[PDB]
Amino acid sequence: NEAGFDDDGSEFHEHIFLEKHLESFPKQGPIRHFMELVTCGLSKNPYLSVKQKVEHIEWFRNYFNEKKDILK
Amino acid sequence: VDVPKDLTKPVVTISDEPDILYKRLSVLVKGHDKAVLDSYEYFAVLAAKELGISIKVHEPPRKIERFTLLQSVHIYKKHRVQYEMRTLYRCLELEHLTGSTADVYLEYIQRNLPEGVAMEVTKTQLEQLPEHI
Amino acid sequence: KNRAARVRVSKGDKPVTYEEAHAPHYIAHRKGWLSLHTGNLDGEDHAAERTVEDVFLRKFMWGTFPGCLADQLVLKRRGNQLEICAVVLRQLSPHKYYFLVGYSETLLSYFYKCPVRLHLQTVPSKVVYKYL
Amino acid sequence: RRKALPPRTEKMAVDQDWPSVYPVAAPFKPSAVPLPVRMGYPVKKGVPMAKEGNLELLKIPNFLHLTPVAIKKHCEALKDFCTEWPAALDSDEKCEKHFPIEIDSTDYVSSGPSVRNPRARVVVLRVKLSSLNLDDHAKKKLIKLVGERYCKTTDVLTIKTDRCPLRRQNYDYAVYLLTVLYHESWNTEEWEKSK
Amino acid sequence: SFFTKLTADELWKGALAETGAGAKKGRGKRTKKKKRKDLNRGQIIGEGRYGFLWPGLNVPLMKNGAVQTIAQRSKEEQEKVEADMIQQREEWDRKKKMKVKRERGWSGNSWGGISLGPPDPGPCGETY
Amino acid sequence: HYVDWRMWRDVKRRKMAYEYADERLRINSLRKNTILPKILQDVADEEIAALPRDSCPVRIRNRCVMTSRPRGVKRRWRLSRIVFRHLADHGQLSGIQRATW
Amino acid sequence: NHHTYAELMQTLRFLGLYRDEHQDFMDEQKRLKKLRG
Amino acid sequence: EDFIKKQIEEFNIGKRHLANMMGEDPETFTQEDIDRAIAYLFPSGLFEKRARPVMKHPEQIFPRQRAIQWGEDGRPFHYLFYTGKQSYYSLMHDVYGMLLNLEKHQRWLIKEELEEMLVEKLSDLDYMQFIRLLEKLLTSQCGAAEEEFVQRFRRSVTLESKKQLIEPVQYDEQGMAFSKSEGKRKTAKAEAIVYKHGSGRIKVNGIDYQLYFPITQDREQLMFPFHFVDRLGKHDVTCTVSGGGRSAQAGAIRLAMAKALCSFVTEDEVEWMRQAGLLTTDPRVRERKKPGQEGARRKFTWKK
Amino acid sequence: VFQDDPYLMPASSLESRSFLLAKKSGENVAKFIINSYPKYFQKDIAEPHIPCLMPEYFEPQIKDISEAALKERIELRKVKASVDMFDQLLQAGTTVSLETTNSLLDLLCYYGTWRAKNNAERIFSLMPEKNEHSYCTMIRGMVKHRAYEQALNLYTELLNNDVYTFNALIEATVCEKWSKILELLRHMVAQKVKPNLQTFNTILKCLRRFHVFARSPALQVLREMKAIGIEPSLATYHHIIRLFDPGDPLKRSSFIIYDIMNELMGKRFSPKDPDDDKFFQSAMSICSSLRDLELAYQVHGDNWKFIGPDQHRNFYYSKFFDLICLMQIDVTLKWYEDLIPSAYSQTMIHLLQALDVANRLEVIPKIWKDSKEYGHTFRSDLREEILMLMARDKHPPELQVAFADCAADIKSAYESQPIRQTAQDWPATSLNCIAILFLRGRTQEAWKMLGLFRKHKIPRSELLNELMDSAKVNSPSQAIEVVELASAFSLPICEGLTQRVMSDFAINQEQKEALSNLTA
RNA sequence: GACCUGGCGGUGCUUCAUAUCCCUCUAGAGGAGCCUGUUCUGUAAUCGAUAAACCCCGAUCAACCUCACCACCUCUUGCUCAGCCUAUAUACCGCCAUCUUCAGCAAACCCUGAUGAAGGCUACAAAGUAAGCGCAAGUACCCACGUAAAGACGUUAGGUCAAGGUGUAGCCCAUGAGGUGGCAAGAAAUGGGCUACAUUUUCUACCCCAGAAACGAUAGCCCUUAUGAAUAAGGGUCGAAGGUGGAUUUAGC
Ligand SMILES: [Mg+2]
Ligand SMILES: [Mg+2]
Ligand SMILES: [Mg+2]
Ligand SMILES: [Mg+2]
Ligand SMILES: [Mg+2]
Ligand SMILES: [Mg+2]
Ligand SMILES: [Mg+2]
Ligand SMILES: [Mg+2]
Ligand SMILES: [Mg+2]
């Protein structure tokens, strides 16, 4: 059931461990809380691949970087 | 009278790495006809016998799902029509089965399916411990 | 009084075949299913797509072999390969028969991206079960 | 106008290669089949339908191919290719001794053009901790960490893996998880020493 | 839609309305009756709007001992075929609907002076 | 050539929901989260409010494919009860029996 | 998509291979209606 | 008519072909072999044998049809032919002849059986006439050929057993005799071991009855087998159960205890217990609920 | 490939050809519809994407000289190349790449006749940069599509400035020429090309016809091929076998080639030459002349693909069965009755004469019935042959029933076709034996059939014998009303009647005897 | 005027009534509240069935599509080689109620009645013979009983052009199509179901050996949570009507 659709040789740790993709925020803040839960849900989801996960992450990056007006 | 002289044989290569050891191949056939399931399992057990492996048989119970529909179109709530989907199970387990034997047997059976049947493989293989532990 | 997949009793001048003569509550008891797939079984899916595609198949083939068939079809889907079985009459030419066979097989294969095959059985006159 | 030749019934001999004339799965083809086998509800003072127009024989699944002779032929042919199981492996206890780590996957196969189905991804594995841990502190630690993945009646720790879509991703992630779990049960902390 | 379409006989039944209320009690109707027709028997399966020449069904496969090739019927030939098929359908309908002349016997709308021909032959064989 | 204009509208709604399914879920999570700022919640609320119509998967309906009947349709087979009974009587489908139990 | 289905079947009718009974009925009654006004 | 012989010879040829297929000497070959071969080579989920695929011999496929009863010209062969019912008429004639011969010297057969033995149908009235003529003949003495004529039609009584099966005793370690039995119920199934040498306490899934059934009617049902037989404190029993209902499990264990004790106790007491009626599985089960009904039997209120 | 039911069962070679050609035409129609409406099948419903099933795209893109040039070799035509040369020479005046010019020249030489003349005279405008590849491809084109003086001029020009290039040049030079052939071979072997022996194959093709003074040197040339050790001896060997063609069979060389092809069959084969299809056909053509059965068996893994065209398969099977018939014949008829459904007039004639020389009378009926079942109808050559051979016999008394049956079937076929006029002359030729067989149980049929024959005649001696035997086999009037009428018709029946009238005929009545006396 | 057939008889005699007629047995509806339909009131605000044989009916779903109503604003070959939930169920197909908790319906022959409509039965037998359908039998569940299933010819021009299609008649700048909104409340009557009106009751742990009380809100107000972009379950308060049923009526072996 997987002859083809190899996901470009992606890796289980590349899917699950988003610690390296999460670098541009501290460890305690509420944005860290939300993004930790996001990475949790993404690693829990097998249906979507590393590309989908990184586009989610970068869209969130753009979101709160444009909404950097508050940081409260 | 026409009997060929040289029967073309495939090419085979025994790679250096070892074959995998399957502990148990447990196949589960879902069907609609008990007679078709009996023929299929007889076929499978005869193939397993002729290949020289252990066997066992048992028949899990019949599962059925029914649901009620309106018999007529516009206004009739008391008069309904019913239907049922019947699935019949059959299990076949094979123990102490080599990887290449699994390959050839599953190729044979997977090409020799009938139509109205679903086939669920559960493969159990043992392996040694890792190196990092 | 229910009217469902049955023929009204006439004076006895209506040739009727087995499947359309027998009732739809004789399906598993005294008939077989026209199609055979596993989407109806538990655990599978795409059953709606299977139904839609086989209905379209039956319609298209009935209308691209019109006037020759005299009964419903037999569908046999073993994994990937699809198999069709038909009963037809022998009034037209084998030229046309083979041409339309190849045409329909190629079209079905190109549409469904699936290996398809179809067979046809000739009859001089459609077999009749009874006169109802 | 055109007339069809008579069937192959009288043409085919009693001595005949049925596996050769029916190598693969195919329809009934009563014209080729010499057997008068009929099937159908008989009418009062009547009989079932003749094999020719009996489309119900086609409706039902087909097994004229793959006779017992054909099965013997193909099995004694593929005997050359099948391999032998190690005779040293003769019992469950000895197989689990040789290779303690059990792992099993599964998947369905169904009729249709498509073949992918997410249930292909799930896998599970099992190992008895009676012989693997070789210590007591790490054993107590691990059994405290794991909540329900164990069972002491039969004494096997079992864990599943479905977080990844790929079977090999599930496999190697389970392996790495077991490795890191052993390495983290090896050590301890001060709040764990204080209980 | 195409999925909504279906075979002919049920459409013919629904259009003719042989039974359901009108036929019963003998009330009938006021001399309106829809005539049966078969469209599939009329035209050969080959022709259409785009007049591709089919060596398999439309054109004889071999000519001068040479395999044929798929070709295009020009629009003038297409119009000729359409015109002669219109003529053929009109001729068929003309032959279908015509007069009926049962010889006048004692009077019109009376079965008095009409003969049904001699009796039918017997089972054992007796020509009358 | 869909069955009718209501099927056309339903398919348009399905297209819009599919092609906006990502951002809708993203901002819905960003809204329903609680620890984040309430001002952020309100901004995301007004953003969802400004999102276009027919973009939600709530306005669509699991309608029939053949006759476009919204009611009496099975999610598995997707067919209306009437067409279901038609096919089950004509024996077109496979592996279904009358529950004479 | 009924788009693909019906477009294919219409183009194939124009080819002149699929004798569509329902369409023959429809356009025959259309001819009758346009003849009778 | 030649079609029959053509079918017979073609069936023999197809039988030889099928023997070659399945791989056996066509000399030795049987109808059960035909049945198994057709069942394996062409399975079918049809329930009725008449609908299932069958490869049968033509003599049994076709029913006997009355052959031509008159030559190519002139008279017919039989002498009641100008009327119907000729065979039964001649039968009544020679039967009455044998009757009057008897008087000067001085199980049954079904209507359809007689029909298909002959080549004509008949009525219940003249069937009763035939039966009363048979017993008229039989009430008096009967010769050898006459008894043979009667038993030609008379069939086997095929009497049933009317007996409760006896299970075999069993022996296990430390010289322990016992008997095992199994009982069932609506939804409860149990099995009990009865130890003869032992006596007193009773076990149920590893728990005593006093605390397994807080209610006393269940214990009364458990005692009813021992009470009728009158052996109360001379037999101990263990039992395992799987069921939903309390009274259901009670009845199941009662049936199991009785079915285990019937082995130990004499056949006379087995007959006494069968007369008591505690050695038969209850066939009664909750009826199905109907679609149009509010329940299994109750309908919606007639609204008028 | 053919269906299984008997009606669709193709029962003759021509109709089977037409049938699978109609199937191929349907395949081409499918290609046409898919490449005319790709968007319909554009959906990739199948999980594994397959370009074999994807619709096909021969659509030129927007005007883009560089991408258009890259797409030239993708579109595989000539109008695009003309337009691209136009756009590059007239207004641009630049070359995208020398490799692109080489590929354009390749395509135009492959596509090639005033059109070929124009295409060849429009290539000299190409930018000065014309390397070997360009020159030798121009030579290829001018050889395989036009005359040879142009190729020779181009080769001289190249010399002034490849394997199959020189192959085409040798073809051009050749197509008596002793010195030419010799110097060509010598300088070709002198050069360091080291051909793939396709040059040798082509020069053999050109030497298809010549006397011994080049047939025998071919043997030493082949020995040199073997010494260098390249050739599998697949096509040149067969071509020299054909060149052996012939006033007298050469048994010595025949045995030599038998051993050669015997070891060639013993070893396994691999295809290298496109001309291995004529191999089969012309090899069996030579085998038919040779006439040997061990030879046929020797000529008989996946080497059965080289038959290919139905015409070559037909020639092969025909000659094979002919040799097998003209070789007991029990094993031959066994092989035949085995291959008849798989296999497809002359063969049946040879079968009939083989059965005649064998004397196996009981077999011919089944063969005629099989031929009739397949395609034997509306032609009476084989009917005449079978009738003559079967009623030359009368030695089986019980088989006269089968005689009558096959005669009745033959007449049922004979009288089918009035409109064609061909059935009128069939009884005049073959009715005699048919009526004799009918006479040999039923007799009234033969009586009325001879009546119809004589009332259509061409009397015959065996016709007189038939009339005599029929008359002698009880009924004077019934015999007279035939023999006397045929006597009044013709003279030999009268000289026979002179004797027929002695037993009991003349005593009946004198009016017919008076007519006989008058006619005599 | 006399006859043939059927219906009807508050039409006679006999045999019956299986939960159906009753006498009988039980539990319910017609009592109060709530939920959900019907009639009716008003609204710009669908539609159809609307005795037996509808009233938790199309609907195994209407907060927005579902929407078919309506106000407002736009498109004119309009996804459709157009479209229309516009009328006609008194054109229909397709699908079902009804007697049916029936057992008869019947091609094709013969006969009687003076060759009329019509009838055709006497078994110790007098003109009826019967294809075929249905019933029945067998098949499904645990059996062979039982339950399901099945239940023809036909009545109610029975219901449904709104599952879908279709004949006829119309709109075809519209009576078609597209996007915002509300519409879907109750002075009232009626129907089906739920709750309790008690101590066989209420609460507590267990589902049955106990201890307390001498009950009742699924309505209302406030709040939380479920999904949604925008009714449901839970918590606090409110702690009544209600005291076991109007003729009459429903279901059950
Ligand atoms: Mg009903
Ligand atoms: Mg008049
Ligand atoms: Mg709505
Ligand atoms: Mg409208
Ligand atoms: Mg009505
Ligand atoms: Mg019944
Ligand atoms: Mg029912
Ligand atoms: Mg009405
Ligand atoms: Mg919400």
Side-chain angles (χ1 to χ4, degrees), chain F residues 43-71:
Chain F
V43 173
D45 295 358
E46 55 78 20
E47 181 278 350
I48 295 297
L51 286 177
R53 293 290 87 194
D54 287 28
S55 178
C56 58
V58 177
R59 190 180 293 275
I60 57 167
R61 178 66 180 274
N62 295 114
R63 297 180 62 84
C64 183
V65 291
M66 295 293 290
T67 61
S68 184
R69 186 179 174 85
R71 293 182 178 90

Side-chain angles (χ1 to χ4, degrees), chain D residues 38-97:
Chain D
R38 65 180 65 257
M39 184 268 285
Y41 184 73
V43 176
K44 296 185 286 294
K45 297 185 266 181
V47 295
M49 294 176 71
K51 62 183 284 185
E52 289 79 0
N54 189 352
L55 74 163
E56 293 78 8
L57 294 170
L58 279 293
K59 291 181 188 179
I60 60 169
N62 200 358
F63 288 96
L64 79 165
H65 61 96
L66 299 170
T67 61
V69 178
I71 301 164
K72 289 187 289 292
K73 191 184 285 292
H74 299 97
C75 292
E76 277 57 70
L78 275 295
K79 184 69 175 177
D80 189 328
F81 295 96
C82 62
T83 57
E84 60 82 15
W85 182 261
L89 297 172
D90 56 278
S91 69
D92 293 26
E93 67 278 16
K94 286 177 73 66
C95 293
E96 62 85 20
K97 184 263 286 181

